[PDB]
Amino acid sequence: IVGGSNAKEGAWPWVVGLYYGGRLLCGASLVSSDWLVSAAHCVYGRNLEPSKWTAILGLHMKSNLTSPQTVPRLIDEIVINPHYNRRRKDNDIAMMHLEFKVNYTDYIQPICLPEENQVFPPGRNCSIAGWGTVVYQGTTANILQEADVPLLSNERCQQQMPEYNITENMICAGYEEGGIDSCQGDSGGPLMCQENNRWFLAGVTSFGYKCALPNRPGVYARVSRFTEWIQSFLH
Amino acid sequence: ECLPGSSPCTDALTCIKADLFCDGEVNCPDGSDEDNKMCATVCDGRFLLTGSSGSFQATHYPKPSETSVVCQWIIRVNQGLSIKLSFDDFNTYYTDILDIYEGVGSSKILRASIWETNPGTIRIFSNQVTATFLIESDESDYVGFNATYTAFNSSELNNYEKINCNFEDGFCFWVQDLNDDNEWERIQGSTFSPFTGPNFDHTFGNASGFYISTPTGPGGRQERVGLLSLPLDPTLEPACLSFWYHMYGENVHKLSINISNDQNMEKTVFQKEGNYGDNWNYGQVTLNETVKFKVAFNAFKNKILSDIALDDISLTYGICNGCGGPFELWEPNTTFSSTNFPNSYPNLAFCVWILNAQKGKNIQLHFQEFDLENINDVVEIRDGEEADSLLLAVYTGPGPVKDVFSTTNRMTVLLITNDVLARGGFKANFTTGYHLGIPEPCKADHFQCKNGECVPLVNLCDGHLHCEDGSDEADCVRFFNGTTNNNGLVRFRIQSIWHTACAENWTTQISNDVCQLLGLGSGNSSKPIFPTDGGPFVKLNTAPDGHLILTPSQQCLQDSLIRLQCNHKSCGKKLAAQDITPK
C-alpha cells in the first residue's frame, strides 16, 4: 500500500502477519481454525522447517506484540500448490497449518471464501490490507495500511503486461495511472471485495512489474479456481 | 463231477470253490490251484512274481486293445519289506478299473481304484500285494499301461519322508482311510463342478501340477474323507506341521485335523469353518506328543459346491513361528553427480535431470549426499510428464531429506543456484519399481486412508480419529440434487452405500449438527417435501452423550425427505468497532 492511509484497529481481523524468525515477509488469510492462505512465492524454499514461521493472529501494529488481543501461533505444515511454478509465477497459492487452535473473537474472525463460478465484474472496488511499503525504494510501514484498487479484465491486463503471461487463474487489480497499488514486501496480501455485506478472498498479491508506477497494476492469484484444493485441507 | 460252480484240482479228488483259484492261498492238496499255467494271464503271461523287481503290462501294450481279458498279479517279497509300484504310463477307459488288493486270499484289502488318471507312485506296506485288472470297454483308442515294482524297507523311513509330500507324484506314504465315506481323488488341473475349489496347483503355480481334493461327484449326503499317515517316532523337541489348505465353496462345513495314537484317543488340534476365498491359505499347527501319533486330515464334505483340496504338506522341527549439465538418463545411469560434485559446486549453475522410465513405473529418488546453501539455493523435484510441470518437494540445505516417490514415468529436477556463497552440493541415485512409496492397500473390505493404515469400519464416519490424515472421516454425507451450493438432500453413507435418511424424529438440533458435519454453518431451516430415494434410508437420532445414533433400519411409513438448507459460516463480517469514512 503506497497511496493509502492508516486502518482502524480491528477493521481487518482476517489479516495474519507471518514472521520468519522475527521478520514479516508476506501476509496471510486465516480461513479455518488452523489453516491459513498465503502466496506461494514467499514460502518457496522454507517448507522444510515450518517451525521458523510464527503466525501472529489479530495484530494491528508491528511494535505492540504485547497486546491482550494478540494470540501467538506457530506453523507446523506448509502445503504449496501442486501446480506451482516459480519461474512462470503460476499457481501462486499456498496453505499454512497452525500449531494450536484459536478461539474466535472480535479481532480474530475467519475470512470468507469465493464460491466456484462467481462472476467478478471488472472495475469492482476491492479493499486490500497488510503492512506493505509506502514507496518503491523505502521501508515497511509499522501501521497496518489499506488501499482500494479496481478490477481489470484479463485481456486488458494481458495487453498492459506484455512481459508476463497472465493465465486464467490470475485476476488483476490496480489503478490506470498507478499511484495506489501493491509494493514490495506486501506481495501476499489478501484482495478483499465486498459482496452482499461480505468480504471474500478474490485474490492474493503475487507479483508486479514495479511499485508506485503508472499503468502497472498488481497481479492477484484467483483463489476462485483453487476452491476445492483449499476445501480438501480445511477438513 | 463236482458241484455246480466248483472246479476240481489236478488229482480230481478234492472239490474247491471257483473263486478260490489264483487268489493267493494254496487250496489243492498238491498245490495245483497256484500253478502258473492255470493262472496264466494273456496280459503278460506271468501270474506269480517272486523276484525283487520286474514289470508287467496288459494285453498287447504297444497296440490297441481288442479283447477283454481278466488278469491278476500276485507279488511276494521278503518279510519286513514293502512293495513300491511305479506307473510310468496309464491311459485306459473308466470302465477298466484297476483294483489293488492288500494281502492274499479272501482277506485281501482293497486300497484304491484307478481310472483315466495317472496314479504315479503307489507304495503298499505289505509284502504280498494282489493287483487285478478287469477289461470292460472295447474302445481301440487307448494304449494301455506299464508298471514296475520295486522292494524297499519301510522301517528306515524318517518323519520327514513320511510327512513331507508335495503330492506331485501320487501319494508318498499316505494311507487312505478305510472306515470313511469316500477316498481322495488325484485330479490334475481344473476339476469338475466349476466355480469351486482351486483352479491351479500351488507348488508349480500352473495347471500342470498334481494335488489331492475331495471327490467332485454329485454326492447327495454328507460324506467324510480322511487320510491316515504313518506312525511317527516321538522326538524330544516339538515340530511344526505346515500345509496349504484351500477351502472355497458354498457348502463348506468344517475341515478338522485329528491326531490318533495307540490308545485310539483322538485329539483335534486344527479346525477351520466357513469360506476362506479362492486362494491357498497358510495353515500351521505345533505338534508336541510324547508317544507315537498319526496325522489325519478328515474333511467333512456337504452336497454339491463344497469341494476342499489340500497340497504341500510337510513337517518341520520347532515351534511354529509368527548451464551445460547432463540431460535425460536411463536405468544404467542410477548414480550421478549434478555437474561438478567432487567438491563445492560453481555458481550460476542451472541443470536438468529428466529421469525416464517405462510406462507405468514411478521413480524413487534416494539422496546419498545433500549439502546445499540457504533458501536462495533449492532443488525443485517435479512430476510433469507434459508441458504442465507439477511439484513434488522443495529440498535445500545440508540435511537428511526423505525419499521422493514419483507418480508418472518422468521426473524433472531443476537446480536453482545463486551467484555467491557456493556450497558443497547434492548427490542421489534412483531405482525404478512398481507402485513404490504407496503401500499395498489391504484387501478384504479394508478401507485405506491417506496415511496408509487399514481401518475397515472402526472409523468410517462414526466419530473417531484413527487416521492422522483425517481421511478416515472423509466424504460420506453430502448434498444430493441440490439447486445451489448450500442446498441438497441429506444422503448419508454407512459403509459404501450412499443412501438418504428418514425424518421420523427430525429436529433443529440434529439439523444444525448435520450442517456442521457437512462443513457448513448452522441449520437455517428444514422442509420435508416428498420421499423419492429407495435406498436403505437411516433414521438419524441423537443422545445426550453428544454423538448422533444412526440406525439404518429399512422400515418406515409415510417417510419424508428433509430438504436441508444450512446458512453460511463465519464469513468476512466486520464485528469490531469500525465506522464508514470515505477516506
Numbering used by the authors:
A (entry chain B): 785 to 1019
B (entry chain A): 183 to 504, 524 to 784
Tell me, in the authors' exact words, what the paper reports.
And active hEP incubated with nafamostat was subjected to cryo-EM structure determination. Cryo-EM reconstruction of another ~29% of the particles of the active hEP-nafamostat complex showed an intact hEP with the LCM domain rotated ~120 degrees from the position of the inactive hEP LCM around the loop between MAM and CUB2 domains, with this inhibited hEP LCM in close proximity to the LDLR2 domain. This considerable flexibility was thought to likely facilitate substrate recruitment and expose the catalytic site for subsequent cleavage. The light chain was observed to remain firmly clamped by the CUB2, LDLR2, and SRCR domains of the heavy chain within the core region, allowing for the intimate interaction between the heavy and light chains after the hEP-activating cleavage. The binding of nafamostat or other covalent inhibitors to the catalytic site apparently results in a change of the conformation of the hEP core region. The complex marked by the dashed line displays one of the active states stabilized by the inhibitor.
